[PDB]
Amino acid sequence: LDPVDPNIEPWNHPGSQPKTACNRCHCKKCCYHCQVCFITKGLGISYGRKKRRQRRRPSQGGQTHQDPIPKQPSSQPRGDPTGPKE
Predict the structure, then answer these.
(1) Is 31 within any annotated ligand binding site?
(2) Positions of E strands within 22-65
(3) What region, left, alpha or beta, does residue 22 occupy, with left being phi > 0 and alpha being psi -120 to 50 degrees?
């Protein structure tokens, strides 16, 4: 775990497939800060996250992030045409 930063850097979704196209729907919103496989396998449950583990807070151009942009989809309804987020 914790290779580059997260396991496969899965903080870049269209907001219409990995979280809408009949995907997982069981471990993505399992009340746990929504980590979705990141620096720790505990899923940010309570091992001691540092937030800076992302090393790309300013990167959110269609990133559909969860911790940095939990505000909304962002860069979707007003940025890149993902699908039904416009």
Answers:
(1) no
(2) none
(3) left
Q: Is residue 37 within 8 Å of residue 31, measured between CB atoms?
A: no
**Is 13 assigned a ligand-binding role in the annotation?**
no
Q: What is the DSSP letter of 32?
A: S
How many of the other CB atoms lie within 10 Å of CB of 61?
A: 10
Enumerate the domain spans of the chain.
1-86
The response to whether 30 counts as a known ligand-binding position is yes
C-alpha 69: how far from chain center: 9
The method of structure determination was: NMR
- Asked if residue 38 lies in contact with residue 53, where contact means CB atoms within 8 angstroms, the answer is yes
Residue 22 labelled as part of a binding site? yes
Q: Assign a CATH topology to domain 1-86.
A: HIV-1 Transactivator Protein (4.10.20)
